[PDB]
C-alpha cells in the first residue's frame, strides 16, 4: 500500500514481492525513507531496523532492497546510519543488531554501502546492571562482536 | 511450571515463555496464574506453606519461580512491615 503501516508488515513478513513499485512511488511523493513518517516516532526504528529484527532464518531479502531504495534517494550515509532516537535503546543502529543476531553476511552489506563504525549504544538498556541496564558492552560494534563470543564479525572489523 | 509446548495450538495454555533472547541473555517468563491468588480462593503457594506437611517442601520450595516470586514481595512489603 501506500501508508507506513503496510510497510512495517511486509518487511517483518519477508516478501519482496509485495513490496514492488515503492521505489517510483517516493519519485511520485518525493518522500525520503527516513524523512518524518517511515520511521517510528516513539524509538526511531526504521524500515531497516525492523528487517534485522524479524528474520527469516537470518535472511530477509529486503535488507538489499532497502539499501537500493536509499541508493536512489541519496541516503546511504543517513539510512544505514541512522540511530534510535529514544532513550532506553537509544544510539542502537542496524550495525548494532546484524552483529547481535550474527548476521556475517548482513554485517560486511552495511558496511560496503557506508556504515558508521563508530556509533555509540549509549542507551540506558545498554548500561551496566549497577546503572540499570541489562548488558554492558562499551557501545562500540567492535566491542559488541568481542562479547558476542564472534571473532568473524572480529576478524572482519 | 517448566512447561513450553512446541504443538503451537495448545500454546494458550503454555507456562513458560520466551520474550526476548539478546545474546547471551535470555528472558523467560513465568505465569502467575495460580502461584499469587490475588483475589481467588486459594493459591499454589499457601498450599506449599500452610498445608503441605511432607519433608519435601524445602526442596518444593527451591523451584525456579518461587525463589524470585518470594524476594518480589519481600523487598516490597519487607521493609514496610518491619518499620511499622
Known amino acids: 500500500?501506500?501508508?507506513?503501516?503496510?510497510?512495517?508488515?511486509?518487511?517483518?513478513?519477508?516478501?519482496?514481492?509485495?513490496?514492488?513499485?515503492?521505489?517510483?512511488?517516493?519519485?511520485?511523493?518525493?518522500?525520503?525513507?527516513?524523512?518524518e513518517e517511515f520511521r517510528e516516532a516513539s524509538t526511531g526504528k526504521t524500515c531497516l531496523t525492523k528487517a534485522l529484527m524479524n528474520l527469516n532464518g537470518g535472511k530477509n531479502d529486503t535488507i538489499p532492497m532497502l539499501i537500493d531504495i536509499a541508493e536512489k534517494t541519496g541516503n546511504l550515509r543517513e539510512f544505514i546510519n541512522s540511530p534510535?532516537?529514544?532513550?532506553?535503546?537509544?544510539?542502537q543502529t542496524a550495525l548494532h543488531i546484524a552483529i547481535e543476531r550474527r548476521c556475517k553476511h548482513y554485517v560486511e552489506l552495511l558496511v560496503e554501502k557506508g556504515a558508521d563504525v563508530h556509533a555509540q549504544a549509549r542507551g540506558r538498556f545498554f548500561q551496566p546492571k549497577d546503572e540499570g541496564g541489562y548488558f554492558y558492552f562499551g557501545e562500540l560494534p567492535l566491542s559488541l562482536a568481542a562479547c558476542t563470543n564472534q571473532p568473524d564479525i572480529v576478524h572482519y572489523l | 511450571?517448566?512447561?513450553?509446548?512446541?504443538?503451537?495450538?495448545?500454546?494458550?495454555?503454555?507456562?513458560?515463555?520466551?520474550?526476548?533472547?539478546?545474546?547471551?541473555?535470555?528472558?523467560?517468563?513465568?505465569d502467575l496464574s495460580m502461584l499469587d491468588t490475588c483475589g481467588e480462593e486459594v493459591s499454589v503457594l499457601e498450599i506449599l506453606v500452610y498445608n503441605s506437611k511432607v519433608e519435601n517442601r524445602h526442596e518444593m520450595l527451591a523451584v525456579e519461580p518461587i525463589n524470585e516470586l518470594l524476594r518480589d514481595k519481600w523487598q516490597k512489603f519487607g521493609a514496610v512491615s518491619f518499620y511499622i
Open chain 1, 84 to 91: 534510535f532516537r529514544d532513550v532506553y535503546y537509544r544510539g
Open chain 1, 1 to 35: 500500500m501506500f501508508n507506513r503501516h503496510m510497510l512495517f508488515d511486509i518487511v517483518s513478513r519477508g516478501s519482496t514481492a509485495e513490496l514492488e513499485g515503492f521505489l517510483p512511488f517516493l519519485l511520485a511523493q518525493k518522500k525520503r525513507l527516513t524523512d
Open chain 2, 1 to 30: 511450571i517448566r512447561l513450553e509446548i512446541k504443538d503451537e495450538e495448545a500454546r494458550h495454555l503454555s507456562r513458560k515463555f520466551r520474550d526476548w533472547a539478546y545474546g547471551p541473555v535470555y528472558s523467560s517468563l513465568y
